[PDB]
Amino acid sequence: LKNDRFLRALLREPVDTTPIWMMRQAGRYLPEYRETRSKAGDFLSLCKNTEFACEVTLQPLRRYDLDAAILFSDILTIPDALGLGLYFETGEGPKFHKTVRTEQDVANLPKLNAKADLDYVMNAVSTIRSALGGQVPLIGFSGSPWTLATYMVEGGSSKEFRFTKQMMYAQPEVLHALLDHLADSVIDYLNAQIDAGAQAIQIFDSWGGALAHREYVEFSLNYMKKIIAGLQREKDGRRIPVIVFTKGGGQWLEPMITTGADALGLDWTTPLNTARTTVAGRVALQGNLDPAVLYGSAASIEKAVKAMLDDAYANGEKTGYVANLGHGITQWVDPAQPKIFVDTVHEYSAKYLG
């Protein structure tokens, strides 16, 4: 690796400057993404299109001095591979032809053979890893068991999680069986991504923030802890750092540390300075800028990013922080603006580092 500052920061090793990458850094806000996307087919076939996947993964790296690439894929690969039939309904988002509702439904789920069933994901990982030429590390990822379960039980996107929470409170042993199946699936999936070339791992618990605080531990967190216990710790003489991210989970930092994750993701509602003092060097932190900050002027973005770094380094620490947004880049962002974000993070860091 010519550049490994991202990995060093996550592992709380000395770094020359603050690393940065951006969730959804490959996406519609880029004209070249849309142009590439138009040559492709249906929205479902994008992830299975290895050429497309590799191409759009590389595009933000050509524009911005990012310190990591992330696999272009979808968390919903796993429930599709488990046979629930993913499709997209314009314009209501992802849906499934089958839902999981009963004890027997859960028992009937097939075991995921990720290397075979999701071979197209592994081909993307390996192809991207080759294309990167060691320039920056590659992040592999999965949805969390709770977050994947919501799609499988609701049958798609959900604002209230009516059926999954009904299962949680009325049939908890059924939901636990589903979550356990998914934890094993995610272990297989992530380890296969590592085998294929992933150098860091992020678990996206996108809907864990919907849970009541005790239920977050029982029905989401404990299953992420199980996953991490099953992952390869190292590959090619290097630690593989793991990031856990539960958006809206800022009140639950202390439980999150018990997952054994190297790093925790934060959104904009969490003060970075108090999160840093609270975790006290026990884990690294990633985040946490509101993407809408990038709707402001160049000058305002610069000021906002400096303030965020001030919060990150107020406690005197010189590592353990990766700058990022608190959610994905929106499709409305002016492609000039993330450059301000990246360059300011790298340059202003000299105030605190070295």
Please give the residue ranges that form the binding site for its own copies (CB under 8 A): 160-162, 165-166, 168-170, 209, 211-216, 248, 250-252, 268-271, 290, 292-293, 295-297, 300, 304, 307, 326, 330, 332
Binding of residue 20 to Cl ion (CB under 5 A)? no
Binding of residue 256 to Cl ion (CB under 5 A)? no
3-state secondary structure of 234: strand
In the list its own copies, Cl ion, none, the entry touching 161 (Cβ below 5 to 8 angstroms by class) is: its own copies
Q: Can you spell out the DSSP letters for 190-225?
A: HHHHHHHT--EEEEE-TTGGGS-HHHHIIIIIHHHH
Quick one: tokens of 198? 């992933």
Q: Which of 9, 11, 23, 71 binds Cl ion (CB under 5 A)?
A: 23
Count of residues interacting with Cl ion (CB under 5 A): 2
- Write down the least CB distance from residue 139 to Cl ion, Å: 8
In the complex, residue closest to Cl ion by CB: 23
Residues with a known catalytic role: 24, 28, 37, 74, 151
Residue with smaller CB distance to Cl ion, 109 or 128: 128
Query: Which long-range contacts does 2-8 make (Cβ < 8 Å, 24+ apart)?
Result: 2/134, 2/135, 2/136, 3/67, 3/135, 3/136, 3/137, 4/137, 4/238, 5/67, 6/67, 6/68, 6/136, 6/137, 6/200, 6/322, 7/137, 7/199, 7/200, 7/238, 7/239, 7/241, 8/319
Quick one: tokens of 90? 């314009």
Preceding peptide of 288 cis, ω within 30°:
yes
Contact yes or no for 36/55 (Cβ under 8 A): yes
Question: What residue has token string 């010519």?
Answer: 2
Quick one: tokens of 128? 């991207």
Contacts to Cl ion by CB under 5 A: 23-24
